[PDB]
Design a protein around this nucleic acid. Structure first.
Lengths: 453, 1313
DNA sequence: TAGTACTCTGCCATCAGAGCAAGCACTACGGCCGATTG
DNA sequence: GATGGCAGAGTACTA
RNA sequence: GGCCGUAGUGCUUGCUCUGAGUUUUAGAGCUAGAAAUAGCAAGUUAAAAUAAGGCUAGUCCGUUAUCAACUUGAAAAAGUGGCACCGAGUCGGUGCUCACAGCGUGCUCAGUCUG
DNA sequence: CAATCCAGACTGAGCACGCTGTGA
């Protein structure tokens, strides 16, 4: 029923999008710059047919118009991680080095989910289709982007410039972020209760009750409809407690992990080459926030990653592999950090590997927010156990800052090394400033912690 | 962007190259192909070689130019004689000269009578009957006193003038002096009359045989001295005899003259030298000197004239007439004898022009040697032929007047005959009486060598200056040509400029300023030590002045004892002119230094006394007549290396003192010239730098041409520079880190024959007479050594046998380990090598003592050289010391050749151009030079064997290995950049012996680490685990860019042989009006380049236009005509409606791609060459090397055995190699008959040992080779060439234009045209 | 059936010499000379 | 000193 | 290492000359035969050309060096061609873009202290 | 007057490779 009410907002009915608020944008160039013409790189016959339907449909919408320009870059298809859609990519390698640089303002994936509070339990995830094509491109900068496409059936051979912001351009993610942010900035004012999270094109709406989400979703759809952006209706989780956003499951205000992601990590067999081990490590690393003490757990496999070495899968390596497989089976539910309340961090350090968990108050219990673990630098590796904990706290406190948004937090550790920092038995002065800042960090009652935590 | 290095191997006819990365891996990138073909890209490796034809020197061109000039001058001489005779010849027979000009003309082409002299048959026949040869007419004109026909007089004079004779002897010759014994007796009588106290007796001495012997002049003088009592060599009579026989004696000891006063009888200055000597001693020796001159004339003439001159004034003509008569008598006798004894061979002897004999001797091309060789057995197998055989043995049987031996006839004989004819016939001809002097001038005139060509501003070679602008005839040469200025320009155009002042000419070596500068430099380096001195002290300026004035300005040689006594004890060119001018204040004066410089410059510049005296006339008022005469007598030779401006002109900016002034006023510092020019405070270095900046540098080709070396090497250098630039452009305009380069080190039989003949004549032996040896036989090394050693052993005193050759031991004087010299100057043939003593040093002291006299005799006979003698007698000097051994070992690895230094400097200047803030050039690219020894040792040690007969890939492989080895060496040993990168005895010996020992896993047993590290730095310079595998992979790649440099042929038009007349279209007219079909002409023209013409031709009676595509050979002669108007040139050839756009220029070695990768190279417009290289597997290459035993065996017995077992187990590789050759031939060579013959030979010779089979299989790669086909041999079977004599197939192939590296190509599909 | 047209095989290629001048490159001996820093 | 020209004998296609 | 002085060898460039060699013509071939042919006689020398030739018209020059293709050029000359990886029978195949984030490792530069 | 022609550890900044993830 959502599609019928807002014909101007859904991509399956509203057609092509066009930002009616942002003006056409001139793509600037460096002072010492000259046009460069690069011939279209060879493309396989299977990949050529992938893009061809897109060019035919891109021509009808007016995005691609024939032109004669001295700039020319080789078109290149990139198939989606799924199926063989073969999305069109311009391959602006040479133009990127020639185009000017602007300060990026895109949000990093670590900090978006930190803004989501556990109070807002109802979600509505909308993803905007053909996001980068919404912004119009000034005809002056249109000759900058071009490519050679000759099809005898079409009857047109030559360059086809883009009238909108192309894909594969280095400034596209930044320019699209600001453009969308200004349009929705007015929406945020009108609805103080709603929490709107924006990731390039993906939008997440968080509300308190079911009725609040329904009212907010209608306003958001109406707002985007006038602005011209079109949202895909095939994949749009609306008014559901269970939503998938940023690759994370969101249920009961907890940042779960998708069951499919766990299957991929364990599904791979025992690695036999450094390339095979590198593939497995990367999957595990994305889940490092869920696995407690992941730095020490995957310690044996790290020296095997080096390009110059012999891949000897010894019994110790198999023990490290089994630990990661079993840890991901029972990965806990990381809670959404609440910025209003203070944080709590447990720190522990055994055998030169720092481990800990960031927790927050949940009723009478503590709920984990993110598991933090690191490998101590070799300079701190040789330190005595009393001094090793001081270095371990500093490393983990740096990691906690990237998620707590700079809010004050309490560092709890078994030992009482908090007084040791004041009177230790260059770098030490750096550690003193980080750990003694009462505004950002403090030490609570000294107490041990459970090994699992 | 990637760090890379370039390796280059430079040969005389090949330049290999290879680009390597940090891991010694050759990159590979796709390259765009231009053209109309469907191929638009190609993948190639960055390794290859460029092959080009070897360059040539200008010697042949210079000889041809000299021949042209000589022919022009001879024709001009004949023209002068005709101009003199013209009026009277027009009065007598007006058409005589016209008939003479048109002698080379067929009957229908002559506009006058066919008979050239008289014009009628009766008179011509009578003349030829009366004078069968021109010498008969010449003798008749010389001897007869009656009137003679004017045409006959002109004919004799023209013959004499056209064929004058050599100008080797100066002065005048009197033919009347012919008897040797009579003149010797007269000389002895004069000597006895003068020297009464000690008379000389010469009775009973065969003076004629002794003086006229065929031995050397020195040997003849020695024999005459031995057979003459009362005097010996260096005596008065001995010196007179030496002067008579031609040697230059020193008469100083005879009269105690204290001056050399050497007299050479053949030299032009003999009269002046004799006058000076007579003024020195007296006038009573003039009779003796005149007798010696007459004896010399007789000695030189009697060997040539060999006739009685008491009855005729034309001894040469009389000798030729006697030769004619002897020829006639011998011919009659031979005819009679052959008819009597061997009638069946009479036809083949006196009628067949093909076979040698009389018919082939006269009518055919057989020479005197061939005639004698043919007719000697016939005369031997006959009776009554004893005197004919004697004449044959003495080379005086049936001799023509015009022969090769006539090159020893002086022009003075012809001059005397011409003078006699003119004297006889001047009474009847007043015009002959008047022009006698100018006719003699015509005969005897020759342009001086220093004058040069008589050009007028349109010749690059000429340098002569004319004082008057008019035609230079032989009669006004002195009055038109400025001889002194011409000679000065001749000398100055070749002398060097100063290197510190490139625009300043150098001073003469014996210049006064040069002498003063050198003496002062030598003086400033003598540190005197005497009593009362705390430390050694240097001479002050005033002390140096006093020493120079007291010692140097007084005595020629200043010694330390003289310095101590005449100055330290008594007180504490300049000398040559002092005895000449007899003036001390003039020489010590300082305002006449310009006069002195001009005097010494004149003496150095001019060698002729007349030129010296005419140049010195301006200074005649300063001196007296005798002083001027002495100055003319004195002459200096030599040019210095320092300019007058550098020595005394330039002054310091701070002090205003010249280099000479500082040298005079050095004082306590006593800094020499090098210190003065390298001082930073002094402005001399700055001024030197500024002077060298002016001019900067010329073009690359001009600089390479100005370099010194072989033209082939210079061409290789230019090609190397161009390929370096091409590779830099290919790699993205990024210069490489290092450029490792290397350069190879590199009729003779006639020269060996002349050298052995001269040595045998000097030594007095008769080894050649015992058993003559031909030049081809003398080309053998062992035979050459045996003959040079006079047939006797060199290390011990015994006699060797020629019939026992191939059994004696060849030994190197310097051991081969220390120095790798295989020349005859270092090779010695002896019965056993063990006679030399120890094998690790110079020959032993006992052997040196035994054979010192023999070696000295060989040196005096010019059989061995000074270097050979010094090497042989090094045991007495001390032998090869440890320092010498270490040096010799080091120099086998460190390159020291000046040509390599020049190449490195050129590459460094091209690569590194940027400068720092302090004007310090940044060494962005490090140019490394290595010798071939390092790479060859690497290949031998690590099984990377090289076989040159497989293909041309070895050039590229050598370049790659050079790059790898150089980069690894400079990584491991940064301290060696001084001796490798352009920019104690025991310790040095073992350092360079194990310099390359870091590559190998085991030493000597030392377990060297698997990974080689830099040391003191964390750089891995080598990894034996994988770097050897990388080298093996690179050497096994099948793609290597081999490019043959296309060139446009230049040179001679065709073969120089003039063929007789024949009805062939290939003959080329010698003149525009000479029909080849009636006069003969040249053939075999050389094609400059082929031209692809697509046109229509007239075919059949109807002359229908048929479209034709073909190749036309544009020869060298018609290249200019074609380039001036190709349309008209092609239309004249018969082609109509040609296309200028479709005309394609195709030089030699043009590459065509036909099918299955078959490549043909354009040898000419009607021939093709192979253009494909077989890439044999490296396993087969190594097996072939080991089985063939390249360079015999040079491994340890433990290592030698395992290689033989390896070959034994890999016996079956021979069949696989044969299969590879056969399949490559089937795909490319397409020589079915040759392949079948090769396979049959292989099948029939299968049972022979693996060694012989592999050695013969190496020859089989000649069939599958790139370039012109050549014949080879497999065991007994010889396989001829399969030449591709049709270029029709390439007209539908792909024409590939390859760059200098082959990475850039333009493929043109000729089938679309 | 004779006239061009193409292929294969063997033969054949100008050669000796004498002076003079200037220069470079290399080898081989003997005498002597280097300077700066620790 | 190879390597291209050249003549001559042999063989074959076409008017 | 450099400075020299002495000697030798090899090579390069330029100039002035010499002797041949080759080609056409001249040097009446005779006798017996229709003729091919056979038999005898004779032979040695000379003229001219010696790169065709050129204009600059000289008693000059003409065989050395240099030379892939295309565009701009009068010429001298200047420009023209993507990279990485896996392989190998004269080279073949595959791939290429972004922005942000996470983890492991290495390198360069600079500074600090100590010997 | 005689002989020869920097090591360690740490810290900071930048860069890069060698994998993954969120998206386009």
């Amino acid at each position: 029923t959502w599609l019928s009410d807002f014909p101007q907002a859904w991509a399956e009915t509203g057609g092509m999008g066009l930002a009616v608020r942002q003006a056409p944008l001139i793509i600037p160039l460096k002072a010492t710059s000259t046009p460069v013409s690069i011939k279209q790189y060879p493309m396989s016959q299977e990949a050529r047919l992938g893009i061809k339907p897109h060019i035919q449909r891109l021509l009808d919408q007016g995005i691609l118009v024939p032109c004669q320009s001295p700039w020319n870059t080789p078109l290149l298809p990139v198939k989606k991680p799924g199926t063989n859609d073969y999305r069109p990519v311009q391959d602006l390698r040479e133009v990127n080095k020639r185009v000017e640089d602007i300060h990026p303002t895109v949000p990093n994936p670590y900090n978006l989910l930190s803004g989501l509070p556990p109070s807002h339990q109802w979600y509505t995830v909308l993803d905007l289709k053909d996001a980068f094509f919404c912004l119009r491109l000034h005809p002056t900068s249109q000759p900058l982007f071009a490519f050679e496409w000759r099809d005898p059936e079409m009857g047109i051979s030559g360059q086809l410039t883009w009238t909108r912001l192309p894909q594969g351009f280095k400034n596209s993610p930044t320019l699209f972020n600001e453009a969308l942010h200004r349009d929705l900035a007015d929406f945020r004012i009108q609805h103080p209760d709603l929490i709107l999270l924006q990731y390039v094109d993906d939008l997440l709406l968080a509300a308190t009750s079911e009725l609040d989400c329904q009212q907010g979703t209608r306003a958001l759809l109406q707002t985007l409809g006038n602005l011209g952006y079109r949202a895909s209706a095939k994949k749009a989780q609306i008014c559901q407690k269970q939503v998938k956003y940023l690759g994370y499951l969101l249920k009961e205000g907890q940042r779960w992990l998708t069951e499919a992601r766990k299957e991929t990590v364990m599904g791979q067999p025992t690695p036999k080459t450094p390339r095979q081990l590198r593939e497995f490590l990367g999957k595990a690393g994305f889940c490092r926030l869920f696995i407690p003490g992941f730095a020490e757990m995957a310690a044996p496999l790290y020296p095997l990653t080096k390009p110059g070495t012999l891949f000897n899968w010894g019994p110790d390596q198999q023990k490290a592999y089994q630990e990661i497989k079993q840890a991901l089976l029972t990965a806990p539910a990381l809670g959404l950090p609440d910025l209003t309340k203070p944080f709590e961090l447990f720190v522990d350090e055994k055998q030169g590997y720092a481990k800990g968990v960031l927790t927050q108050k949940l009723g009478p219990w503590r709920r984990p927010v993110a598991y933090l673990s690191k490998k101590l630098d070799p300079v701190a590796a040789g330190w005595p156990p009393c001094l090793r904990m001081v270095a371990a706290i500093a490393v983990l406190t740096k990691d906690a800052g990237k998620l707590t948004m700079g809010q004050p937090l309490v560092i709890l550790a078994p030992h009482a090394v908090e007084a040791l920092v004041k009177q230790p038995p260059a770098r030490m002065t750096h550690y003193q400033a980080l750990l003694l800042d009462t505004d950002r960090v403090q030490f609570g009652p000294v107490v041990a912690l459970n090994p699992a935590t | 962007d990637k760090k890379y290095s370039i390796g280059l191997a430079i040969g005389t006819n090949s330049v290999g190259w290879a680009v390597i990365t940090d891991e010694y891996k050759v990159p590979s990138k796709k390259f765009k192909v231009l053209g109309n073909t469907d191929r638009h890209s190609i993948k190639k490796n960055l390794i290859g070689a460029l092959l080009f034809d070897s360059g040539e020197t200008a010697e042949a061109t210079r000889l041809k130019r000299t021949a042209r000039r000589r022919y022009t001058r001879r024709k001009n001489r004949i023209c002068y004689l005709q101009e003199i005779f013209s009026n009277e010849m027009a009065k007598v027979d007006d058409s005589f000269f016209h008939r003479l000009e048109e002698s080379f003309l067929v009957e229908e082409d002559k506009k006058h009578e066919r008979h050239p002299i008289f014009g009628n048959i009766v008179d011509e026949v009578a003349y030829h009957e009366k004078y069968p040869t021109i010498y008969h007419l010449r003798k008749k004109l010389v001897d007869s006193t009656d009137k003679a026909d004017l045409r006959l007089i002109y004919l004799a004079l023209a013959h004499m003038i056209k064929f004058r004779g050599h100008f080797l002897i100066e002065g005048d010759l009197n033919p009347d002096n012919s008897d040797v014994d009579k003149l010797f007796i007269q000389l002895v009588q004069t000597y006895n009359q003068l020297f009464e106290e000690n008379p000389i007796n010469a009775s009973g001495v065969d003076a004629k045989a002794i003086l006229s012997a065929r031995l050397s002049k020195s040997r003849r003088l020695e024999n005459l001295i031995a057979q003459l009592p009362g005097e010996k060599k260096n005596g008065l009579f001995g010196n007179l005899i030496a002067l008579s026989l031609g040697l230059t004696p020193n008469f100083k000891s005879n009269f105690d003259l204290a001056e050399d006063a050497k007299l050479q009888l053949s030299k032009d200055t003999y009269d002046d030298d004799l006058d000076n000597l007579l003024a020195q001693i007296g006038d009573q020796y003039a009779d003796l000197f005149l007798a010696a001159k007459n004896l010399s004339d007789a000695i030189l003439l009697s060997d040539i004239l060999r006739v009685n001159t008491e009855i005729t004034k034309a001894p040469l003509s009389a000798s030729m007439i006697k030769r004619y008569d002897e020829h006639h008598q011998d011919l009659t006798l031979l005819k009679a004898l052959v008819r009597q004894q061997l009638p069946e061979k009479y036809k083949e002897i006196f009628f067949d022009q093909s076979k040698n004999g009389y018919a082939g001797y006269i009518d055919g091309g057989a020479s005197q040697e061939e005639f004698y060789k043919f007719i000697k057995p016939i005369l031997e197998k006959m009776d009554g032929t004893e005197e004919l055989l004697v004449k044959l043995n003495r080379e005086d049987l049936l001799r023509k007047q015009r022969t090769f031996d006539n090159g020893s006839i002086p022009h003075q004989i012809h001059l005397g005959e011409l003078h006699a004819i003119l004297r006889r016939q001047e009474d009847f001809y007043p015009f002959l009486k008047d022009n006698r002097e100018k006719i003699e001038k015509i005969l005897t005139f020759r342009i001086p060598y220093y004058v040069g060509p008589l050009a007028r501003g349109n010749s690059r070679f000429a340098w002569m200056t004319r004082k008057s602008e008019e035609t230079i005839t032989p009669w006004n040469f002195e009055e038109v040509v400025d001889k002194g200025a011409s000679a000065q320009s001749f000398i100055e155009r070749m002398t060097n400029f100063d290197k510190n002042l490139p625009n300043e000419k150098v001073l003469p070596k014996h210049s006064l300023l040069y002498e003063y500068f050198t003496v002062y430099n030598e003086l400033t380096k003598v540190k005197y030590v005497t009593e009362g001195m705390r430390k050694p002290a240097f001479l002050s300026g005033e002390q140096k002045k006093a020493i120079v004035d007291l010692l140097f300005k007084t005595n020629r040689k200043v010694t330390v004892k003289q310095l101590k006594e005449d100055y330290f004890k008594k007180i504490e060119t300049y000398h040559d002119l002092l005895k000449i001018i007899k003036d001390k204040d003039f020489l010590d004066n300082e305002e006449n230094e310009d006069i002195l410089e001009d005097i010494v410059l004149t003496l150095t510049l001019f060698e002729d006394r007349e030129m010296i005296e005419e140049r010195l006339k301006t200074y005649a008022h300063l001196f007296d007549d005798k002083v001027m005469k002495q100055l003319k007598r004195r002459r200096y030779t030599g040019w210095g290396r320092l300019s007058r401006k550098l020595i005394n002109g330039i002054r310091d900016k701070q002090s205003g003192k010249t280099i000479l002034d500082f040298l005079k006023s050095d004082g306590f510092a006593n800094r020499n010239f090098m210190q003065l020019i390298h001082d930073d405070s002094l402005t001399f270095k700055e001024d030197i730098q500024k002077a060298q900046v002016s001019g900067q540098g010329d073009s690359l080709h001009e600089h390479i041409a100005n370099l010194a070396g072989s033209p082939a090497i210079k061409k290789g250098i230019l090609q190397t520079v161009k390929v370096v630039d091409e590779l830099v452009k290919v790699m993205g305009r990024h210069k490489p880190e290092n450029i490792v380069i290397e350069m190879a080190r590199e009729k003779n039989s006639r020269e060996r024959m002349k050298r052995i003949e001269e040595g045998i004549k000097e030594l007095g032996s008769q080894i050649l007479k015992e058993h003559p040896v031909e030049n081809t036989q003398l080309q053998n090394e062992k035979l050459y050594l045996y003959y040079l050693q006079n047939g006797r052993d060199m290390y011990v005193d015994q006699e060797l046998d020629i019939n026992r050759l191939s059994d004696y031991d060849v030994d190197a004087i310097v051991p081969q380990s220390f120095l790798k010299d295989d020349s005859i100057d270092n090779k010695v043939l002896t019965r056993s090598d063990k006679n030399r003593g120890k094998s690790d040093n110079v020959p032993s002291e006992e052997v040196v003592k035994k054979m010192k006299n023999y070696w000295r005799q060989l040196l005096n006979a010019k059989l061995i050289t000074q270097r050979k003698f010094d090497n042989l007698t090094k045991a007495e000097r001390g032998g090869l010391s440890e320092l010498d051994k270490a040096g010799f070992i080091k120099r086998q690895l460190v390159e020291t050749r000046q040509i390599t230094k020049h190449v490195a400097q050129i590459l460094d200047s091209r690569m590194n151009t940027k400068y720092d803030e302090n004007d310090k050039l940044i060494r962005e690219v490090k140019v490394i030079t290595l010798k071939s020894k390092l790479v060859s040792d690497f290949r031998k040690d690590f099984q990377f064997y090289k076989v040159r007969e497989i293909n041309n890939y070895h050039h590229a492989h050598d370049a790659y290995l050079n790059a790898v080895v150089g980069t690894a060496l400079i990584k491991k040993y940064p301290k060696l950049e001084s001796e490798f990168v352009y920019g104690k005895a025991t310790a040095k010996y073992f350092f360079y012996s194990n310099i390359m020992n870091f590559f190998k896993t085991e030493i000597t047993i030392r377990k060297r680490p698997l990974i080689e590290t830099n040391g003191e730095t964390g750089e891995i310079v080598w990894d034996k685990g994988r770097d050897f595998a990388t080298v093996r992979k690179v050497l096994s790649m099948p793609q290597v860019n081999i490019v043959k440099k296309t060139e446009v042929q230049t040179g001679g038009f065709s073969k120089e042989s003039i063929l007789p007349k024949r009805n062939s279209d290939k003959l080329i007219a010698r003149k525009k009006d000479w029909d080849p079909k009636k006069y003969g002409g040249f053939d075999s023209p050389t094609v400059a380049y082929s031209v692809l013409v697509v046109a229509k031709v007239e075919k059949g009676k109807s002359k229908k236009l048929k479209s034709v595509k073909e190749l036309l050979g544009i020869t060298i002669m018609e290249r200019s005509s074609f380039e001036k108007n190709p349309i008209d040139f092609l239309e004249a050839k018969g082609y109509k409606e040609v296309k200028k756009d479709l005309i394609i220029k195709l030089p030699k070695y043009s590459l065509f791609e036909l099918e299955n990768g078959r490549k043909r190279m354009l040898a000419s417009a009607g021939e093709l060459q192979k253009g494909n290289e077989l890439a044999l597997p490296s396993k087969y290459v190594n097996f072939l090397y080991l089985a063939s035993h390249y360079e015999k065996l040079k491994g340890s017995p433990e290592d030698n055995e395992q290689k033989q077992l390896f070959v034994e187990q890999h016996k079956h590789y021979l069949d696989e190699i044969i299969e590879q050759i056969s399949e490559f031939s089937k795909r490319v060579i397409l020589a079915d008959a040759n392949l079948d013959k090769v396979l049959s030979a292989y099948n029939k010779h299968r049972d022979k040992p693996i060694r012989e089979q592999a050695e013969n299989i190496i020859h089989l790669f000649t069939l599958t080779n790139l370039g012109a086909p050549a014949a080879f041999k497999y065991f007994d079977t010889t396989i001829d060439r399969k030449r591709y004599t049709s270029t029709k197939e390439v007209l539908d192939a792909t024409l590939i234009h390859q760059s200098i590296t082959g990475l850039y190509e333009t493929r043109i599909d000729l089938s679309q045209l």
